[PDB]
Structures are given as C-alpha cells and as structure tokens.
Design a protein around this ligand. Structure first.
Ligand code: NAD
Ligand code: NAD
Ligand code: UD1
Ligand code: UD1
Ligand code: NA
Ligand code: NA
Ligand code: NA
Ligand code: NA
Lengths: 338, 338
C-alpha cells in the first residue's frame, strides 16, 4: 500500500516506518521536525531496506496535505504527528489543542478532499481517564483525561468517530497504549529526547548513563506487591508492529476499530529500575519521594481484543526493553547528529 | 468598554449588540455572513442608538482577528460566531468542529497575541449531556453531549478552562442556556431562519403564519403533567441582557465564571403551542407523532447562581416570547432584505 506516515521521523514513527518498508509498502513521511532531526532519515532507509519519501511540513497546512495525498496517490494514513508532553500541555494548552486537535482536523479535511478513506490514529490510553477498574478494556466507556494533552487525544477520537459515521465508507483505527520504550535492536535508532525526560524509562536511562544523579520514586506505600506504582510498558518494536498489522488488516474495512496495544500486564517502578540496572551493568541510583498527585497505584491495558481480531500480541520482554535502550545509548551517546 | 462581538449579525448577537450600544459601549461586529444578512446592520444601529463598526470576516482567520483586536483596541470579546444546527452537525461533523472548535481556538490565539484577556463565551446547556437530575446546576459535572454540535461546545469550554489556568489573569464566562426565542419588542429584529426550522418555536411560528401545514408533536405519553416534553425557553432579550451584565461585571475579574441563563422553569410542548395560538389569534395546527429518540420527558436549568452573583434574572414571559415573535413575523414577513 501507499502510506503517508505523519510524524514519521519521530520515535514511534521512525520504527514504524522501518517495518512498513520491510513489508514492502511505499512510504511517504511528513514531519515538521519540531521534535526530530533529518539525520534519522538515512537510518530509516537503511534499516528498512528501501527508500521512503520525505516531506518537511506541518499537518496544520491543509493545502500541502491535500497536494501530498494526491501526488503520492496515498491509500492510507498512519498519524503520529502531534505534541505529547503532559506537563508542558498544562503550561501551554493552546499549542496542544492546535497541533493535536486542529492538526488532525486539517489532516482529515485534506483526506476528504483527496478522496483518501483509510486512517490509523496513534491514540493514548489516557482516554480511559480515571477508571479504577483495571485492566482497561475497549468496552469500557472513556473518562475525562486530566491534562490538556489527554483531553486533546480524546477530542480527536470523538472527532474521527463522528466523521466515520457521516462517511461510512471510511476505515479508522484508534490505537490506544501507554508507555512505549525500547529501541530498534540495531541500537542505531531510539528515543532522543531533548531536555528533561518525563517518562520513567528515559529518565532511568539518563541517570544510568551518568547524565542525572538519581531517580526520584513517587511513593513507596501503594497497595502493590512492592509498594511502588504499577504501569504499562510496551516495546516500541511491538507497538510499531501493531500499527503495521492494523493498517494492513483494517484497510477498506469500514468502521471505527478500537484496540488497546500492550503486553496485558503491569510492572512496578522497582521492576523497571532493576531491569535497567541489569541491562546497564550497574545499580541505577534512586531515592524515594512522595506520591505524585492523581496517581493510581496500578494501571494497565487488557490486549485480548487485538490478539483475537488482529492475531497480534507482544513478543519483546521488559529486559529487552531495557537492553535495547541501553544498546542505543551506548552506540549513539549524543543521539542523532545535527 | 470596547467590545468585539463575533457573530454580531446573527440572532442572539444582533439583540445583544443593540443592548450594548444602549449601554454606551463601543461595539465592533465581526461576522462572516454565512447565516445572517448585512441588512440587519442598519437596524442594529438604529435600535441601539449608536453606530457599531462592522467587519465581514471569519473567526478562523487568526491574522485578521489579531489586526482587528489591535486596531480597535478591544477590551473584551463576546463570542457568538459558530454553527448551531444539531441535525446538520451529525451530517457534517467536520464543519462543526472547524467552525466551533478551531474557530474559537484561532480567535483566542489572536487575543493572546493582542494582549486581550476578557472573554464571554456563548455556550450551551447541551454540555450537561444526559443528566437525569433536573434542574441542571453549574455544580453538576458535565456529561457527554450526543451530537457533534454538543460535543464541540463542551470541547471549547474545556479548551477555555485550560487556557485560563495557564494564563491566570484572564476572565472567562461560560454562559449556558437552552432555547432562545422571541424578538426585539420593536418587531423589527427577530430570528430569520432559512429553510426548515429545527427549533420548536420557529417551526410553530411558520405553521401559524401559513408556511407549514402542521406541527408534529414528539410523544404524548411522557411522565409530565400533559404528557408532552417539558423544556427550557428564554426570551432573546433576557439572554442578550445576561450576556451584557456578565461582560460588564466580570471584566478583569480573573477566573472561569460559569452561569446558566434561563427562567428557572420548564414549559411543555402544548404550553408553547397554546401561547402561540394565543399570540397569533388562531389555533395552531398540530398532530402527535412518536417520541423522538433520546428525549428526556423534562429538562430545564436552575438560574439561581446568576440571580445571586450577577443580580440577573429573566423579566420576559412565555406569552411575550410568542407575541414578540408573531410581531416580527407580521412586520417582516420576508425577513431581512437581500
Ligand atoms: N501514553 C500515550 O498517550 C502515548 C505515549 C507516546 C506517544 N503517543 C502518541 O504517539 C504519537 C507519536 O509520538 P512519539 O512518541 O513518537 O513522539 P515524537 O515527538 O518523537 O514524534 C512526533 C513527531 O511529530 C512531529 N510533529 C509534531 N507536530 C507536528 C505537526 N504539527 N506537523 C508535523 N509534524 C509534527 C515531531 O517533529 C515528531 O517527529 C503522538 O501522537 C503521541 O501523542 C502516545
Ligand atoms: N442550546 C444551545 O446550545 C444554544 C441555542 C442557540 C444558540 N447557541 C449559541 O449561540 C451562538 C449564536 O447563535 P445564534 O442563535 O445567534 O445563531 P446565528 O446563526 O444567528 O448566529 C451566528 C452568527 O455567526 C456567524 N458565523 C458563523 N460561523 C462564523 C465564522 N466561522 N466566522 C464568523 N462568523 C461566523 C453567522 O453568519 C451568524 O451571523 C452560537 O455560538 C450558538 O451555538 C446555543
Ligand atoms: C510522564 C507522563 O506523561 N506521565 C503520564 C503517564 O503516566 P504513567 O504513570 O503511565 O507513566 P510515567 O512514565 O509518568 O510514570 C510511570 C510510573 O513511574 C513513576 N515515576 C515516574 C517518573 C519518575 O521520575 N518517577 C516515578 O516514580 C510514576 O509514579 C508511575 O508509577 O500517563 C498517564 C495517563 O494514563 C498520565 O496521568 C501521566 O501524567
Ligand atoms: C432542534 C434542536 O437543536 N434540538 C436540541 C435541543 O433539544 P430541546 O428539546 O431543548 O429543544 P427542541 O426545540 O428540539 O424541542 C423542544 C421540545 O419540543 C419537542 N418538539 C420539537 C420540535 C418539533 O417539531 N416537535 C416537537 O414535539 C421536543 O420533543 C421537545 O420536547 O437541545 C438538546 C440538548 O439539551 C438536544 O438534544 C436537541 O437535539
Ligand atoms: Na449521514
Ligand atoms: Na544530540
Ligand atoms: Na502555568
Ligand atoms: Na427572506
């Protein structure tokens, strides 16, 4: 298929692109480079074994989106482009609503204009909001996310859902997940966050590598086996794969297809730290801090539906998540070149 | 104050503008004319006793919005611009999300750029979603609206709320209400809907005037006194007034001010039909039909908060709503001139 991948140079997008190319699809990457560097492009092509077309631009530019779709005769679109920092979203709500909500809107308006009707949305498990019932199932109603970021994700899901109802020939997947971690097994692609990492893994990684002094652990008095918070982590390669399978199997199958992508289990903070100490060969430094306000003691997604309907399930482990991360750091200590 | 009124040439906006001008504010009307005609302008000026500046344009054009705010040194903005047809929204979701959600976003992004921080949002009681607890109070959590229109309204409320939190010096009112009806007592301004009226009143009005054969009443077996659905109707002059008071008293008072605007009581379908037969001098034709799917038997807003905090309450009656409507039809049978 001919696939446009917005946000194709980012973390999840880059790995997905490689898999797409490996499966022989024709890939067009659209990225504005606000959170990625052109230097990943050549890596993508090399690992994918095929050349992807790159277009630097913004999803908010409806005109350019239309042009692209037309020019490349796109069949389907995998949408990763947007902003995703939860704390920053509380500080700069408008940027989040413009990139995420308006950004998706402009993008699907261009699709309509170009006659494209296959869409894969990189969603978020934040949509379940504060559900005390765990694990989360696709059959659970959505809740109210707490940050502008979470809210933007739910808004886009609703917008897409109404669009499908009005244009019943569309096929739209809403892929929900929690924490993507890990890196391509080559160690030549991985997460390259700029500034302070918000996500546990990257943070742990930076402490281990010596960029940070110690990890602060938010609470040690939860009703969990070891007293630390239990979360959901998915290897970026498993996640990329899930996006590819969904794109392939859902194309031209009208409807709104909702799927949780995850391992189907939770891991504690300590579990993740220990996996990492293990991968990097030295004890990661940490200390305890108080609970982070609004935190549940445990949370994870039920991924049965995806197993059943798409025949998809994870195949990477927590240790591999830690190892592959350390492997990329080790090989590209300064990230992607400028 | 210097006030920009988006959607100033529309139904609610036109009446509001007249009141603003009467109170001596300097008014700038911004309207794209998609659902109104330039011919109301001169009426507005005449009834207001002062000249309002008119600018034809779209809220989606951030550049023009910025220019305007600057040029006219705006102090506060009353935002009525958007699309509001519930059925059409189910058919054309994207237009609703673009005009309402993106339209408000572009508008508040321009305000930020121009340093304007007083906003009055014309919201909707649809935000309470399917609350079985009546009457609805501002203290009730919001629910999930059922149509794209309802949803767009809740989305904008949330966006504004997050914006205020991030920019704490802003003053933002969220004015919620149900069914605006009626007309300026001069009979020289009123609702001028094109095509089939969706709202009960306008419909009743068209049947009475002879444009339609009969009113269909959706169910006569509800658990209400007369078996027909009980709703909330507010005279457009009372509504306009509430918008003016809110603008005046809330200016420069930081926060998100939520207020329901209504009479504090419900009226049945038959009640409204009888009021109308009364105003037009002939029995309105009607027949019963089955219940409309998703309808509650009764619904209305509690307006105590506004009485208490703004010292505002309605002063027009149901009969007046009917009379003033008939009065405008009688004087301007073809609506506003082309
Ligand atoms: N728990 C969660 O919700 C979960 C966690 C991570 C990622 N995600 C989603 O996955 C997607 C990809 O995230 P990621 O982790 O790879 O982050 P990322 O920042 O590496 O990738 C996003 C890419 O989009 C680009 N981009 C941003 N705004 C753009 C715009 N307006 N036009 C064009 N390009 C634009 C950035 O340059 C970047 O390359 C996002 O939609 C994100 O919300 C969700
Ligand atoms: N129950 C409810 O929710 C309730 C019922 C009626 C009105 N409202 C709200 O009140 C407001 C005013 O409604 P109204 O009844 O006077 O309808 P209206 O159509 O008469 O007024 C809206 C005006 O905005 C203009 N407009 C539309 N999109 C625009 C855009 N993108 N740029 C500039 N101008 C634009 C139209 O030309 C029109 O003059 C809307 O926000 C509407 O949703 C809510
Ligand atoms: C960084 C981020 O986007 N967090 C979001 C993530 O939370 P989520 O809890 O899934 O993931 P995080 O990476 O934020 O935290 C993982 C776990 O590690 C803990 N932890 C994290 C970082 C750290 O320095 N120390 C520490 O102890 C957390 O308390 C938690 O128990 O998705 C949730 C929605 O479902 C949101 O509520 C969160 O705001
Ligand atoms: C036209 C419109 O926007 N309706 C919206 C309005 O409903 P809402 O019920 O407030 O107002 P309407 O004008 O649609 O209907 C008023 C009453 O009259 C009845 N009626 C209406 C029209 C008609 O031809 N015959 C008839 O019998 C309705 O069943 C109801 O009992 O706000 C609600 C949100 O709170 C939405 O759920 C509705 O979709
Ligand atoms: Na339809
Ligand atoms: Na670097
Ligand atoms: Na802040
Ligand atoms: Na006319």
């Amino acid at each position: 298929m001919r696939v446009l991948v917005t946000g194709g140079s980012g973390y999840i997008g880059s790995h997905t692109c490689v898999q797409l190319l490996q499966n022989g699809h024709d890939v067009i990457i659209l990225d504005n480079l606000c959170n990625s560097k052109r230097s990943v492009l050549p890596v993508i092509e090399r690992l994918g074994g095929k050349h992807p077309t790159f277009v630097e631009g913004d999803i908010r530019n409806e005109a350019l989106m239309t042009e692209i779709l037309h020019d490349h005769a796109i069949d389907t679109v995998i949408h990763f482009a947007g902003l995703k920092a939860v704390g920053e979203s509380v500080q700069k709500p408008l940027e989040y609503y413009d990139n995420n909500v308006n950004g998706t809107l402009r993008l699907i308006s261009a699709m309509r204009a170009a006659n494209v009707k296959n869409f894969i949305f990189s969603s978020s498990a934040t949509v379940y909001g504060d559900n005390p019932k765990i694990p989360y199932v696709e059959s659970f109603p959505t809740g109210t996310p707490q940050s502008p970021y979470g809210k933007s994700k739910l808004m886009v899901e609703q917008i897409l859902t109404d669009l499908q109802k009005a244009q019943p020939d569309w096929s739209i997947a809403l892929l929900r997940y929690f924490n993507p971690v890990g890196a391509h097994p080559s160690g030549d692609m991985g997460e390259d966050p700029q500034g302070i990492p918000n996500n546990l893994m990257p943070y742990i990684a930076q402490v281990a590598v010596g960029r940070r002094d110690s990890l602060a652990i938010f609470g040690n008095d939860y009703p969990t086996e070891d007293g630390t918070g239990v979360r959901d982590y998915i290897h970026v390669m498993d996640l990329a794969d899930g996006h590819v399978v969904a794109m392939e199997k859902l194309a031209n199958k009208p409807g709104v297809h909702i799927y949780n992508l995850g391992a189907g289990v939770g891991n504690s903070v300590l579990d993740v730290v220990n996996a990492f100490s293990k991968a990097c060969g030295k004890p990661v430094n940490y200390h305890f801090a108080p609970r982070r306000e609004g935190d549940l003691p445990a949370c994870w997604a039920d991924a049965s539906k995806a197993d059943r309907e798409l025949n998809w399930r994870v195949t990477r482990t927590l240790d591999e998540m830690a190892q592959d991360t350390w492997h990329w750091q080790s090989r590209h200590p300064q990230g992607y070149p400028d």
